[PDB]
């Protein structure tokens, strides 16, 4: 049994540290156990679509409150998966501005932390990388631009579109 729990709003924080319910927000991705529950990752609900990374769910369905969310699109190479709707997160990183990682670590409250991604060279091209370390289960945490928009997901890199 995998389920999601809302953890807060997607907002850029001005006083941040510097270095089937489908309500918009950031959600913990949880799997129930006989003894307890475990946070397997994080995801973003936006425009009635839930967005998380493939390694977190592997296309498994998600129960949101009473209702159920079914997978719609997925790609293992990209490590992404969307539920009941196609991918809605289209914003991109300018390639030079500081971003905010909205980290939602297991067992801890959500927090924002500003940082400047490094640009990592790849055969596909330049990419942004948030050089921060958070526990297992923080994957899927949203990366925000100054306007509160999701430009990427923690652990996956950030696309540049200047």
Tell me what the structure shows.
By secondary structure, this protein is mainly beta. It has one domain (1-162): Thrombin, subunit H. Helix content is 2%, strand content 45%. It has one helix spanning 54-57, and strands spanning 2-8, 17-18, 25-32, 37-46, 49-52, 62-64, 67-69, 71-75, 80-83, 99-103, 111-115, 118-121, 126-129, 142-144, 150-153, 158-159. The protein has a six-stranded antiparallel β-sheet. A five-stranded mixed β-sheet has the order 2-11-10-14-15, with no helix packed on it. A hairpin with a 4-residue loop joins strand 3 and strand 4. It is globular. It is a peripheral membrane protein.
Task: List its traits.
five-stranded mixed sheet; Thrombin, subunit H; six-stranded antiparallel sheet; 162 residues; Serine protease NS3; mainly beta
Question: What's the helix and strand layout?
Answer:
Blueprint: E1 2-8, E2 17-18, E3 25-32, E4 37-46, E5 49-52, H1 54-57, E6 62-64, E7 67-69, E8 71-75, E9 80-83, E10 99-103, E11 111-115, E12 118-121, E13 126-129, E14 142-144, E15 150-153, E16 158-159
Membrane topology: Peripheral membrane protein
Protein name: Serine protease NS3
Active site: 55, 79, 139
């Amino acid at each position: 049994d995998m389920y999601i729990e809302r953890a807060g709003d997607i907002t850029w924080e001005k006083d941040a540290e510097v270095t089937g319910e489908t309500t918009d927000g950031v959600y913990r991705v949880m799997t129930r156990r006989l003894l307890g529950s475990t946070q397997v990752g994080v995801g973003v609900m936006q425009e009635g679509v839930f967005h998380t990374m493939w390694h977190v769910t592997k296309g498994s369905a998600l129960r949101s409150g009473e209702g159920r969310l079914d997978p719609y699109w997925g790609d293992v190479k990209q490590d992404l998966v969307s539920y009941c709707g196609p991918w809605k997160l289209d914003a991109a990183w300018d390639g030079h501005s500081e971003v905010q990682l909205l980290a939602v670590p297991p067992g801890e409250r959500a927090r924002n932390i500003q940082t400047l991604p490094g640009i990592f060279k790849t055969k596909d091209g330049d990419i942004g990388a948030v050089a921060l370390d958070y526990p297992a289960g923080t994957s899927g945490s949203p990366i925000l631009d100054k306007c509160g928009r999701v430009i990427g997901l923690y652990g996956n890199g950030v696309v540049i579109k200047n």
